[PDB]
């Protein structure tokens, strides 16, 4: 499993353990804005946003601050799990309307 | 420079920091120049409102705790200026939040009564938008110019 | 609990080169010397000339840590009024004998209430809710 | 409250025109972030095939080798991908190019003179004077020269002019066509223009009936404003046909009697293909790329 | 020099429409605008591509160091 793709910035991660900043390589607005939108729908997520440190460096930062009973890692895992299901809905509706034509 | 004594000199004497005020008149030679001045007149305008999503984005967009921009190790945020019907933040509140996260927590907020380059007449009837007011590190009146 | 409550008659609604905000000039229907100057977001809560507004100043809503978005089953003082604003008192001015005028700021949206009896209840508090009905 | 099933209830698709090259479809009740994502992928992610390594043996033409090589790369080839595997850059040239990774196109043209009565036409005065894209002969090699039997490699547009010659001049080259993406070079673009336009909204505040209705009708394109009668108000027949010229707002009689906005949820997509894939295939692959991007992050270890 | 392959702005193939454009101006005797429309050039970026093309290659070719006179 490649470890360079997703990294937890411990210098900003809460001792334990709702707030934490994640750094993703080879990513930008494409996943960034889509992922923070889905993470923000979570009733446990207090604060969420994405930030690109600089255009020349291939980095994507996503901050997830939650309320209790859920870690930031869980909120990110839920965000990715929901985006996958969201895409399945888009792919299913598009196939159906192609046939409906 | 190829030695530590020459390094120390270029980092503490000839550096670029300790140079905000020229020794000629003791006036500033550092500040934002064009887009930033035009951006500020629009962002700090009364008409400029922002949703929770928009507001928090503008905060993290310029303040990154990982790059050591914060003084509280957690981005503190002010409550909205409009609660009902929709939660909305004013443009001036972003300026208050930026100071709240970059100034030390141990020290109290800044208190300043300044003026603007833009006269009140331009902002309509009975506006006080020329008077720049900072009370306990909070922009409560006036836009921010080149001034 | 509440600090001020009165019904005001609107005499002016001025945009002043603003597309969403308006400076409201009002007078109390009960007290003669009472006057109001308030900025409201006309986009959400529209105010017309010759209107009856029930303007109310409260300390809180019946120790809080921070504001949270509404979640099913939450009761507040705001549920009784239409338009609610949160702001701070920054200036206390005295106009001649017995009359006192307070200055409030709801994040740039300024308010200037003129009265006399409210000197005790209305105090410079970093937390003051403004609620309006009708 | 937003659910993925609640999105399925409101989300609609409307196909206005679906040609072999361009498709005009609508995406109703979807977010800007999703509509913009598909448009970005249908112009960057979508890859294709085309020359990459032009090996010259002779070029006595006026057109420099670099220029002629660049022109061949720009010529789109009617080659379906998936038939080719991706080339690996680390191993050397003898191992790099295979029958599965590379397609070879040869160009061998020699110009001569012809006897004709003389302004005189170049096709009459000289032989093989104009070099076209159709002159790029497909040469199948290796393990598979039967896979491209019912699929010959021919340029999408054959009449493309590649070079102009005079007797004595000659062009001899071997071009190596490989698989690449549009982000690397434009010579890999699959679709011409993939863009969306928001549905124009015309909020009529006043009835504005009478002769002013006929004046209001001329401010918008012909098939936009429809008038019932002299009265019965002035309605919007097809707000989709509007060009959004704001012509109605530059008139004192209408400047306050009408508002011009949009339907933030409604998107009018227009997708034209370069010729390799159908416009539907390009949109479908765009949705499949966004899903795969979210899927790859789902089954991935969150390091540190 | 010669007609460019694809429109600089969007990327619509323009190289196959040069000789056809002159035929629409000569034989068909049409105006500049209508000729471009029949070729399938509606965007002003694709319109100027062929309309504004000089074709100096025909001037350049008249110098041939490989054929006498
Ligand atoms: Zn073009």
From Swiss-Prot, chain A:
Q: In terms of domain of life, where is this protein from? A: Eukaryota
Presence of keyword Cell membrane? no
What molecular function terms (GO) are annotated for this protein? DNA binding; DNA-directed RNA polymerase activity; protein dimerization activity
GO annotation (BP), single: ribosome biogenesis
Chain positions of cross-link Glycyl lysine isopeptide (Lys-Gly) (interchain with G-Cter in ubiquitin): 93
Flavoprotein is among the record's keywords = no
Gene Ontology cellular-component terms for this entry are: nucleoplasm; nucleus; RNA polymerase I complex; RNA polymerase III complex
Sorted keywords for this record are: DNA-directed RNA polymerase, Isopeptide bond, Nucleus, Phosphoprotein, Ribosome biogenesis, Transcription, Ubl conjugation
Where is it chiefly localized? nucleus
Q: Where, subcellularly, is it found?
A: Nucleus, Nucleolus
Q: How does it assemble?
A: Component of the RNA polymerase I (Pol I) and RNA polymerase III (Pol III) complexes. Component of the RNA polymerase I (Pol I) complex consisting of 14 subunits: RPA135, RPA190, RPC40, RPA14, RPB5, RPO26, RPA43, RPB8, RPA12, RPB10, RPC19, RPC10, RPA49 and RPA34. The complex is composed of a horseshoe-shaped core containing ten subunits (RPA135, RPA190, RPB5, RPO26, RPB8, RPB10, RPC10, RPA12, RPC19 and RPC40) where RPA135 and RPA190 form the DNA-binding cleft.
Something else known:
Present with 8680 molecules/cell in log phase SD medium.
Q: Which family does it belong to?
A: Belongs to the archaeal Rpo11/eukaryotic RPB11/RPC19 RNA polymerase subunit family.
Query: What is the protein's known function?
Result: DNA-dependent RNA polymerases catalyze the transcription of DNA into RNA using the four ribonucleoside triphosphates as substrates. Common core component of RNA polymerases I and III which synthesize ribosomal RNA precursors and small RNAs, such as 5S rRNA and tRNAs, respectively.
Gene name on record?
Answer: RPC19
Q: Which residues of the full protein are shown?
A: 42 to 142 of 142
Curated annotation (Swiss-Prot), chain C:
**Region annotation Non-specific ssDNA binding: residue ranges?**
14-37
Q: Which GO terms describe its cellular component?
A: nucleoplasm; nucleus; RNA polymerase I complex; RNA polymerase II, core complex; RNA polymerase III complex
Q: What SMART domains does the annotation carry?
A: RPOL8c
Q: Name one GO molecular function term.
A: DNA-directed RNA polymerase activity
* Stored SUPFAM superfamilies: Nucleic acid-binding proteins
- Where's it found, cell-wise? Nucleus
Q: Which GO terms describe its biological process?
A: nucleolar large rRNA transcription by RNA polymerase I; ribosome biogenesis; RNA-templated transcription; termination of RNA polymerase I transcription; termination of RNA polymerase III transcription; transcription by RNA polymerase I; transcription by RNA polymerase II; transcription by RNA polymerase III
Q: Which domain of life is it from?
A: Eukaryota
Q: How does it assemble?
A: Component of the RNA polymerase I (Pol I), RNA polymerase II (Pol II) and RNA polymerase III (Pol III) complexes. Component of the RNA polymerase I (Pol I) complex consisting of 14 subunits: RPA135, RPA190, RPC40, RPA14, RPB5, RPO26, RPA43, RPB8, RPA12, RPB10, RPC19, RPC10, RPA49 and RPA34. The complex is composed of a horseshoe-shaped core containing ten subunits (RPA135, RPA190, RPB5, RPO26, RPB8, RPB10, RPC10, RPA12, RPC19 and RPC40) where RPA135 and RPA190 form the DNA-binding cleft.
Entry's family note: Belongs to the eukaryotic RPB8 RNA polymerase subunit family.
Query: Any idea what this protein is called?
Result: DNA-directed RNA polymerases I, II, and III subunit RPABC3
From Swiss-Prot, chain D:
Q: What is this protein called?
A: DNA-directed RNA polymerases I and III subunit RPAC1
Localization per record: Nucleus, Nucleolus
The entry's other comment says: Present with 13000 molecules/cell in log phase SD medium.
Assembly and partners are described as:
Component of the RNA polymerase I (Pol I) complex consisting of 14 subunits: RPA135, RPA190, RPC40, RPA14, RPB5, RPO26, RPA43, RPB8, RPA12, RPB10, RPC19, RPC10, RPA49 and RPA34. The complex is composed of a horseshoe-shaped core containing ten subunits (RPA135, RPA190, RPB5, RPO26, RPB8, RPB10, RPC10, RPA12, RPC19 and RPC40) where RPA135 and RPA190 form the DNA-binding cleft. Outside of the core, RPA14 and RPA43 form the stalk that mediates interactions with transcription initiation factors and newly synthesized RNA.
Where's it mainly located? Answer: nucleus
* Record bears the keyword Ribosomal protein: no
* GO CC terms in record: nucleoplasm; nucleus; RNA polymerase I complex; RNA polymerase III complex
Q: What protein family is recorded? A: Belongs to the archaeal Rpo3/eukaryotic RPB3 RNA polymerase subunit family.
Swiss-Prot record, chain E:
Keywords noted in UniProt? DNA-directed RNA polymerase, Isopeptide bond, Metal-binding, Nucleus, Ribosome biogenesis, Transcription, Ubl conjugation, Zinc
Task: Describe the protein's quaternary organization and the partners it interacts with.
Answer: Component of the RNA polymerase I (Pol I), RNA polymerase II (Pol II) and RNA polymerase III (Pol III) complexes. Component of the RNA polymerase I (Pol I) complex consisting of 14 subunits: RPA135, RPA190, RPC40, RPA14, RPB5, RPO26, RPA43, RPB8, RPA12, RPB10, RPC19, RPC10, RPA49 and RPA34. The complex is composed of a horseshoe-shaped core containing ten subunits (RPA135, RPA190, RPB5, RPO26, RPB8, RPB10, RPC10, RPA12, RPC19 and RPC40) where RPA135 and RPA190 form the DNA-binding cleft.
User: What's the miscellaneous note?
Assistant: Present with 5300 molecules/cell in log phase SD medium.
Cross-link Glycyl lysine isopeptide (Lys-Gly) (interchain with G-Cter in ubiquitin) position reads 59
Provide the Gene Ontology terms for cellular component.
nucleoplasm; nucleus; RNA polymerase I complex; RNA polymerase II, core complex; RNA polymerase III complex
What are the protein's GO molecular function terms? DNA binding; DNA-directed RNA polymerase activity; zinc ion binding
Q: Family assignment?
A: Belongs to the archaeal Rpo10/eukaryotic RPB10 RNA polymerase subunit family.
Q: Which residues bind Zn(2+)?
A: 7, 10, 45-46
One example of a Gene Ontology biological process annotation: transcription by RNA polymerase III
Localized where?
Nucleus, Nucleolus
- Output the PROSITE patterns linked to this UniProt entry: RNA_POL_N_8KD (PS01112)
Predominant location category: nucleus
Instruction: Name the Pfam families for this protein.
Output: RNA_pol_N
- Asked if Zinc is a keyword of the record, the answer is yes
Q: Work out whether the entry's keyword set contains Ribonucleoprotein.
A: no
Name-wise, this protein is DNA-directed RNA polymerases I, II, and III subunit RPABC5
Per the UniProt entry, what species is this protein from, by scientific name?
Answer: Saccharomyces cerevisiae (strain ATCC 204508 / S288c) (Baker's yeast)
């Amino acid at each position: 499993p490649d470890r360079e793709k997703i990294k937890l910035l411990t210098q900003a991660t809460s001792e334990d353990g709702t707030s934490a900043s994640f750094q993703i390589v080879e990513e930008d607005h494409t996943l960034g804005n889509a992922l923070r939108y889905v993470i923000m729908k979570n009733p446990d997520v207090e604060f969420c946003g994405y930030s690109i440190p600089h255009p020349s460096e291939n980095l994507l930062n996503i901050r997830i601050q939650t309320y209790g009973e859920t870690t930031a890692v869980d909120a990110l895992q839920k965000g990715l799990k929901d985006l996958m299901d969201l895409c399945d809905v888009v792919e299913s509706k598009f196939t159906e309307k192609i046939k409906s034509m | 420079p190829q030695n530590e004594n020459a390094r120390a000199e270029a980092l503490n004497l000839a550096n670029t920091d300790s140079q905000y005020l020229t020794p000629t008149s003791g006036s500033p030679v550092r500040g934002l120049i064009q887009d930033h001045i035009s951006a500020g007149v629009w962002l700090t305008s009364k008409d400029s409102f922002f949703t929770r999503e928009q507001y928090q984005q503008y905060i993290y967009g310029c303040i990154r705790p990982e790059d050591g921009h914060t003084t509280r190790s957690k981005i503190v945020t002010l409550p909205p200026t409009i609660f009902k019907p929709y939660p909305l933040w004013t443009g001036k509140q972003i300026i208050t939040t930026v100071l709240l996260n970059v100034t030390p927590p141990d020290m109290p907020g800044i208190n300043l009564i300044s003026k603007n380059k833009i006269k009140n007449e331009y902002w309509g009837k009975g506006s006080l938008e020329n008077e720049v007011l900072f009370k306990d590190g909070a922009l409560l009146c006036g836009i921010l110019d080149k001034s | 609990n509440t600090l001020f409550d009165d019904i005001f008659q609107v005499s002016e609604v001025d945009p002043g080169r603003y597309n969403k905000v308006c400076r409201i000039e009002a007078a109390s229907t009960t007290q003669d010397q009472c006057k109001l100057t308030l900025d409201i977001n006309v986009e959400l809560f529209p105010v017309a000339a010759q209107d009856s507004l029930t303007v109310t100043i409260a300390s809180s809503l019946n120790a809080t840590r921070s504001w949270r978005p509404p979640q099913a089953g939450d009761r507040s003082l705001a549920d009784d009024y239409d338009y609610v604003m949160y702001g701070t008192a920054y200036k206390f001015e005295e106009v001649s004998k017995d009359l006192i005028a307070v200055y409030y700021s709801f994040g740039g949206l300024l308010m200037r209430l003129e009265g006399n009896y409210r000197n005790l209840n209305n105090l410079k508090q970093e937390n003051a809710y403004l609620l309006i009905r009708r | 409250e937003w659910n993925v099933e609640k999105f399925k209830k409101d989300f609609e698709v409307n196909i206005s025109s679906l040609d072999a090259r361009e498709a005009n479809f609508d995406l109703i009740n979807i977010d800007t972030s999703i509509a913009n994502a598909f448009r970005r992928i249908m112009i960057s992610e979508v890859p294709s095939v085309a020359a990459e390594y032009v090996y010259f043996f002779n070029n006595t033409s006026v057109i420099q080798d670099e220029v002629l090589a660049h022109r061949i790369g720009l010529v789109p080839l009617k080659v379906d991908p998936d038939m080719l595997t991706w080339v690996d850059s680390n191993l050397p040239d003898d191992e790099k190019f295979t029958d599965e990774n590379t397609i070879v196109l040869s160009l061998n043209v020699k110009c001569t003179r012809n006897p004709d009565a003389p302004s005189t036409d170049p096709k009459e005065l000289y032989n093989n004077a104009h070099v076209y894209a159709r002159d790029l002969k497909f040469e199948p090699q290796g393990r598979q020269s039967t896979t491209f039997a019912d699929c010959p490699v021919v340029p999408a547009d054959p009449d493309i002019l590649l070079a102009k010659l005079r007797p004595g001049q000659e062009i001899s080259l071997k071009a190596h066509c490989i698989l690449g993406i549009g982000g690397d070079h434009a010579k890999f673009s699959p679709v011409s223009t993939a863009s969306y336009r928001l549905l124009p909204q015309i909020n009529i505040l006043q009835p504005i009936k009478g002769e002013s209705a006929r004046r209001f009708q001329k401010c918008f394109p012909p098939g936009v404003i429809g008038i019932d009668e002299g009265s019965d108000e002035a309605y919007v027949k097809d707000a989709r046909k509007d060009t959004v010229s704001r012509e109605v707002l530059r008139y004192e009689e209408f400047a306050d009697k009408v508002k011009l906005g949009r339907v933030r949820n409604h998107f009018i997509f227009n997708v034209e293909s370069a010729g390799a894939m159908t416009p539907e295939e390009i949109f479908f692959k765009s949705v499949r790329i966004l899903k795969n991007k979210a899927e790859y992050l789902k089954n991935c270890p969150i390091t540190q | 020099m010669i007609v460019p392959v694809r429109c600089f702005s969007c990327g619509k193939v323009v190289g196959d429409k040069w000789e056809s454009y002159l035929n629409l101006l000569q034989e068909d005797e049409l105006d500049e605008g209508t000729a471009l429309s029949r070729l399938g050039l509606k965007r002003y970026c694709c319109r100027r591509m062929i309309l504004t093309h000089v074709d100096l290659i025909e001037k350049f070719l008249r110098y041939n160091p490989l054929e006498k006179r």
